[model samples]
Target chain A: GSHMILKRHFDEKQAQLYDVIIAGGGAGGLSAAVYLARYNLKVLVIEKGRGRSFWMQDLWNYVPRVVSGKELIEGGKEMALHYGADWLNGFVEAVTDTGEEFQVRVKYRFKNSDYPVFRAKYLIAATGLMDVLPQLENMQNVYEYAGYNLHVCLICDGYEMTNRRAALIAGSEKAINTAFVLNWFTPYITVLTLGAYPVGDEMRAKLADHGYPLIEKPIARFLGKDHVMDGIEFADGTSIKVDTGLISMGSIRHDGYLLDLLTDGGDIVTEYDCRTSHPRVFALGDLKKGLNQVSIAVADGTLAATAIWKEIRRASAPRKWTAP
Target chain B: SHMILKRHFDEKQAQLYDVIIAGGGAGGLSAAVYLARYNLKVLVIEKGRGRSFWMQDLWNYVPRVVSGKELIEGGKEMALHYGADWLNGFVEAVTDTGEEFQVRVKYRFKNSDYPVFRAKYLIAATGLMDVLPQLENMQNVYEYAGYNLHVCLICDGYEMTNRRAALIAGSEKAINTAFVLNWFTPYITVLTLGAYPVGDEMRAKLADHGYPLIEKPIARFLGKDHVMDGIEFADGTSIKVDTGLISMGSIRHDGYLKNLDLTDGDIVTEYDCRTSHPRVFALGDLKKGLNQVSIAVADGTLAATAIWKEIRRASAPRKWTA
Candidate 1:
């Protein structure tokens, strides 16, 4: 097959230096690729093939006509490719700044194992965040309903829970606060701790004052069929009817590879243009400390690409005189 | 026409709003959609035409090849679907009412007096306008200016690959643009049109780049309808070229904002579309940033989210500590 043949010949390609090397193939990275490629810059995008947007079932509140994350990513990839950006299906293990340039080691997802080393002048970390789902005894059972009726991102799906019996899965006290925010969308709210952590007495009283039922028992399993969670079975052999659920468990940033380039909160610190502490390295989208919306991510890509293009242009242009 | 009917219907709409957007381009429409989805009353006042109108093709847009008109029309439809009111009018002035804003607007193609609109917040998405070459037959030249004779090199430089190109400008910065064009194609010439001052250092740089410079005034652009065949100078000289790029300069459509202090000479915006005036925000080409449809859409989202956060925080039922 041509796909297999292409995979076999991936490592043999010459390792040419690129103007910008993006770490992920998500909306942010692909958007940057389009702009940089249009600017006539040599850009390379290394994607691990797993962006959180891919897990999204239906996309709403964005621009019209884009129905799902799959459609958005597919279109973005085509646009980036149409403008002449080289894309590789691989996982970037690490990035080392070698003063004048950056050395990136990437491991191909398919074919024989080979860590191809590539070079570039600038690096963009668009590695997005991942939601941390509740770890129940029967964890595989939770996967069936994840991203379906059981959803994450209250901002994206709060409207869907309107007037429905909604359950809030809280893994920590911080996660419990989402219930109050969700209350605006719907009054029928229940906080399920799953006995993962203990809630303070003040928080318990607050929940009670808000007229929300709190369940502290461990979840035995989710009760549903065909990826639509109906309710939860508790360890105490009790159950409550729920039309939908929101998992407020905190997310994990997918930027462990940037060990030396993270903040105390584990987020990639970026300036307004997404420039990191390293001058040539930029971070955008869910990896940076900002809103995790697709529109915001696409904008971040534009700012970063324009900044990089201007720096390169200024450097290559004729030198101007300045008094010492 | 149906357009006239819609204008008549819109005239009866309410004059009070949570947000009064100053332009109905991509940025304004996107911001309107976000604000309307949050249940905030939004009103978008457009002046009938903007820089996006001049964009004939959007081949480089993410997703597909949508024309600029199609993109703007789709965005307007989306904003309207979310319950935002759209009005066709030109804004004459904006007065700060100490508590809110009073936007004075003139109806387009109508004899009605200027109407006043009250809003809690304002967004200036009035994008920049390009300056065309000031020639004898300027109107005739404009028919082919944006079609084959491009203006922005950042947008159409790739299209001019391996083709003879002419760079038309009136200043030294325009000559710098000519040097940048050398990266795309070596067959390039510069026509200053004898409009602005040029320094000797700049001329030396152009000479080093091996680009021929022409400072003669242009009498008229000689071309078939939209395709530029060449240019005729006032000195009875002419040159043939496949395409032409005009870098005269651009004007910011921000006259209504003269009451407030501006940043970066003409723009009134911070990083996240926040202006010096807390109640006013700016985005798109009007802001001091890259002018692209995707960037403008993102700016709309940022301005909408920021305004919503301020409103939500101020109107929360009770202040609770975590």
Candidate 2:
């Protein structure tokens, strides 16, 4: 019987089975799955939902594909399958290793059940961080539709916004960094600091010299038609028409699941390679310390897997054990 | 005399290198070339022979083209043009971290000449040691049919079209081995060294097609000094075979180093990426464990760049972040 809603328990299953099991279906996990599977090792990748990149329309430096984000994820998964990868769809809760095997507890969303069991010789935690959306009552609905229209990442969607009037929804003073970076992509770009403005006089002068507008006002909502966001509607009954929008608010690390696992490294900033003081556990992607990009995450996953695989191989090999 | 020799060495300048590498193959020499071209102290540890020298034909997997032996070498040379150098080709042993990362290399081929060099980093590119036929005359026969007798099917499978081939095996996966070899050759004879005898079902299936099970104990090579004619069984019988033979034998890991776990020794057959180790790195066939030349050279570049990055990151001084 199923244990609970979105959670299941496998009590009778083999205690030790899989060679490598990766958590999260993001690019890093997917790429590592592809490589591990190609090496003829039995690999299982657990993903809670679809890739975050799927919601993105334009990836700043991604190989120029006039294709949508969904196409990119599907193409990447297909490539992994073509190279022989085994993908499992589930939300992993916690992973612990018994010095001989790694036990990953997963929750099945559709059945509202939990699988408290599923073990592997090695583990790669590519569980990426979730993007912290604008805190509005209708924020979920707005993000679902206005995500592609009101995009983030100047490196990704900036080229698409060229020669088009774009709005930069700045959440802090540091949001102006996006404006300067976006200046190379589009000429008509405006920075809308919604109430919480952090720009200084010199930075304001710099934006002014660049012919970029800085509007400090609490945004009431966005004005758009049929999910195609056109501009930002201000609280004081003012609306600025634009072709695109960038929500340059920062992102919160989706590391709540890893809270119990990671030993406080101060400010969520740990060293690279994703080691978080816990044995047999690692974290990467936007959640770890590094430039968060698909390329960097992919590299992180590969490196982490290499390190973990070494330990696993050493343990599994015949050895003369000593009393600890 | 020692002072004069040192003076002559200084005048002629054997070029005190920052790094010295042995083996001109994909791994050893490639690292040397990279370090040397960067004007870093570098030396290549080569046994005076290229690793891919005996490869018959390399089928392009990454870019996709059937490349010949000469083409493979030329491509490697062109790739190594980014970092290529001819260094002394002899190394006896490697010791590390005693003098802030140094190696004592003894060139045995050149009058037991010893060169004590020190560097911040060291890479071991000593590639695979092929498990050859153990017979006395078998080595000569293998050399003669070296072009015909292949070891790795992945490297030369594309060239074995329509050729009558024999796959000699002594492993549990011998049947699967025969099945894979069938893709390259239509008529494949599995010589299993009389271990358990080919399964009756498989034997009956291939029996009608004249693909018989040769379970005879192979006595010796029925060939001239170098060229192999056929295999002479102990039953005083010999059969003439055609084009090629694939020894589906096992491979010994090239772990000739002491306690390779300094950087934590882990060798997994990677898919997209190449092999990377901390102080010790491998390239080409030695890495990836797949025996693809193009992928090996590609592995060479990847290992070199990874080492370079690690070196730079290590040398960078800590800053005061206020």
Candidate 3:
């Protein structure tokens, strides 16, 4: 939201460069930043959005304790900052690779002009995949406390939802499957079609036989009187009460900026050391096609950092790479 | 090595310790401290002759440079501070049960120290071995070379900074070795002992850097017993240079626990840092995975935590003795 500029460049150019430039200050980027810092590598993390994990009201995967999504993000950010992550809260518009070095451009939040470019030897894309929310007027107010009362990932918080009532709001055929699978966690499951019911009658009969509620209607909004979400309201003036509601919407691959950079399938081909298709460019966490977990992200960060460190160490001493 | 006086204790105590660790260095003592803190009945059977006990100082391995003697003593103190000082005599022999679990250690130091300690786990932190220099009538050479002849590059690579380095490789791996050593210094010579497994292109590359290749076998040491002056060749030639020798020779310490089936070249079977032989776990350099100290410590912490969980979850608790 803020931008600063220096009038003139300093005479000493050696002090301005960094070893690695991480794009996107989400979980993966932050984790990588922390690891790079631990190795004493100068790291700069640029965020395009408010925060990578900012939209998350409840982070279910952050387990052992069910902490608020914001708290989880804060904890992770603190760990990265502790190790010296130069986190820049700005939108990185484009990245141009010039051999081993890269030039990343960010939007000038204040001047509304092209922001100053940041260059580094290596770049990492920790910008995680984002889910597409339904276009609704009161969508924000409905899901504002969604993390507390409702959740997205059942695997992360399904244990807590045990024996509790949950409503699966789906607009596609996949929503029926999600509702069916959620029955294992809790017998009390309700399927909200949200005016788009793609499941066949046979499947609906099976769901009804299992005593699972199938509410097929055009939903108006949610009824969250207290901080906790109580139920959902329909255009017919009827409401369905539930303890938790799960939005089973399909996710959009967050590869818009890198559309031309990625493969046909929209995935970055990773090398042995987390290097992407482009040399000196790395992609880790959910941004790449792999298992999305904190442990895996941490491991990827370690690997990417180590690889970058080796390159830096080699570049600093060309004799190391020479025949001798 | 510091010894604590253990007042009279009964030999015929029932139910031996949960874990018995051999070697009290980084890997061994780290596990010991972690397991003991978790309240596991752990007994470290160190020879008191740890890797840290021998050398003067180590240049690397993170958390700052430290003297080997100080590091070994610090490891022991940390282990004891965490209440994991139940160690026996110097290990003479270890007989594995052929299965995934159990091993018998013969204490050569004390005959009566043969308390058939059964453990749910075992962590062998026994480190690397360097070929000790054999010079006739040179006791001083033995002492100096013992302290000077280094092995692990991860531990002492930075110390070779700005100094001429000689790499003595008995095998082909020396090409990569030379490449890695070249990072610290530009003045590096490769002594292949007339056995050059590297390709001609690589040889030409090394030659381009003015890095001479020595084919003759090494003859003698040319320095005071306390420090290495230079190396002499069998061709009656010598190169006067700095510091010490870093042997590129292979190590045989990984085969110490060859009798155990769960091991793959000295890597104890550890799942989630829990060893195959129950309470007996291994980490760090002795581990089969990544050899970095950070990963090793993380493994040590995990193993310690797992053992602690096992000990705490035990149906009944037993008192530990030193």
Q: Which candidate is the best by TM-score?
A: 1
lDDT of 2 at B137: 62
Per-residue lDDT of B179 in model 1:
60
Candidate 1: which stretches are off by over 4 Å? A1-5, A8-14, A110-112, A135-150, A159-165, A219-244, A262-264, A317-324, B1-15, B135-139, B197-200, B219-229, B260-264, B318-322
> Which model is ahead, 2 or 3, in terms of TM-score?
3
Q: Can you tell me the DockQ of model 2? A: 0.03
Worst 10 residues of 1 chain A by lDDT: A1-10
i-RMS of candidate 2: 14.3
Candidate 3 residue runs with Cα over 4 Å from true position? A1-18, A38-42, A55-85, A110-113, A201-211, A224-226, A259-261, A264-272, A312-324, B1-322
Better of 1 and 3 by TM-score: 1
The candidate with the higher DockQ, 1 or 3, is: 1
> Which structure is stronger by TM-score: 1 or 2?
1
Looking at model 3 chain B, report the run of 10 residues with the lowest lDDT sum: B1-10
- Which has the better lDDT: candidate 2, or candidate 3? 3
- Return the interface RMSD of model 1: 5.7
Among incorrect, acceptable, medium and high, the docking class of model 1 is acceptable
lDDT of each: 0.78, 0.55, 0.60
Show what share of the native A-B interface contacts model 1 retains. Answer: 0.30
All candidates: DockQ: 0.33, 0.03, 0.07
Global fold similarity of model 3 (TM-score)? 0.54
Ranking by lDDT: 1, 3, 2
lDDT of 3 by residue, B1-322 (tens): 2232333123312446566676666566666665654445666766565445566664322223456676656666656654665555555445555432333444455445444445556667666655543445456445455454455554455456557777766666655577666655667777776655667887787787666677776667777746676778778999865644556543544443665545466565544555564345666666665444334444555566566555545533221111
